[PDB]
Amino acid sequence: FLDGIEKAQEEHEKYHNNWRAMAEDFQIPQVVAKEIVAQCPKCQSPKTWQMDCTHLEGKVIIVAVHVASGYIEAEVLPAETGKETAHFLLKLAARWPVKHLHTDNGDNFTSSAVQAVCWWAQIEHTFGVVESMNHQLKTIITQIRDQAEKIETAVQMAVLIHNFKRKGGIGGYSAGERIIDIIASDLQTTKLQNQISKIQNFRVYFREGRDQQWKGPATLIWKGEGAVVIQDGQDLKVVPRRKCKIIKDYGR
């Protein structure tokens, strides 16, 4: 246990790893590994979307692309006014978690309807990948145009072929697997951060061996069944539970 913690400290001093690799290799809990990572002075986006409007065969198409994986959601508008753009933005914010929108300086992107939708959905709107995705999507649309009667059917089939059929990258994954894995990693990070704060709201009085005195207040890191991990003097150590007193700390 303590040998694993000291090995993880020497390994992070040498190579500057991440917390997942150390928690998998050295068999330490993830809160201690994230503590070791956060105590490094030299070791210190999954929710951004881009929007675009384009024209094709007399119609107006609007494309929203998740940047970190390449995920395209497209729709066909009847006109290019602000209300239908605000409605498409509201649908995109209703299906996927959006917290940062990147657009250009168009007219229909600068409107009271889009401002009210961004205010109600709490989205940071920023006026300045997408051209490459538009080139790829229009080549797929011209590739399978003959199998559809209208234009919207070809648009949705091209979105399906782009999302779940074209595979590439390092491991050879599609776009849907990449966006699902990225969002799942962000969810794991937020849950572990909540657990870290709820545990770190305590305080521990520890008593050393061959001494009947209580030492200074060390901060609790991980409370186990037989062992207790504390931070004191910018150092991590493991003290058994029979030499510790865990008290609440009101130190805001």
Partner DNA sequence: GCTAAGAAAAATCTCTACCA
Partner DNA sequence: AACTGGTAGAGATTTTTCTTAGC
**Residues contributing to the annotated binding site:** 12, 16, 40, 43, 52, 104, 131
CA 33 to chain centre: 19
Q: Could you say which of 30, 54, 136, 156 contacts DNA (CB under 7 A)?
A: 30
At which residue do the structure tokens 């699902």 appear? 180
- Give residue 233's region: left, alpha or beta (phi > 0; psi -120 to 50): left
Q: Is 239 in the site for DNA (CB under 7 A)?
A: no
57 binds, among its own copies, another protein, Zn ion, none (CB under 5 to 8 A by kind): none
Q: Is 31 in the site for DNA (CB under 7 A)?
A: yes
Smallest distance, DNA to C-beta of residue 250, A: 8
**Per the annotation, where are the binding residues for Zn(2+)?**
12, 16, 40, 43
Contact 52, 134 (CB under 8 A): yes
| Calpha distance 229→217 (Å, rounded) | 13
Q: Could you say which of 39, 54, 136, 219 contacts another protein (CB under 8 A)?
A: 39
Q: Coil, strand or helix: which one is 47? A: coil
Residue of 166, 171, 108 lying closest to 133 (CA atoms)? 166
- Touching its own copies, residues 120-149 (CB under 8 A): 129, 143-144
Q: Could you say which of 177, 202, 203, 205 contacts its own copies (CB under 8 A)?
A: 177
Neighbours of 9 (CB within 10 A): 16
Nearer to DNA by Cβ, of 42 and 248: the residue is 248
Q: Is 20 in the site for DNA (CB under 7 A)?
A: yes
Dihedral pair phi/psi, residue 147, rounded to 5°: -85, 5
What number of chain residues touch another protein (CB under 8 A)?
48
Give the H/E segment covering residue 205. Answer: strand 202-206
Nearer to another protein by Cβ, of 181 and 235: the residue is 181
Contact 167, 173 (CB under 8 A): yes
Q: Which residues bind its own copies (CB under 8 A)?
A: 15-18, 20-21, 24, 34-35, 37-39, 42-44, 68-70, 129, 143-144, 161, 165-173, 177, 181, 250-252
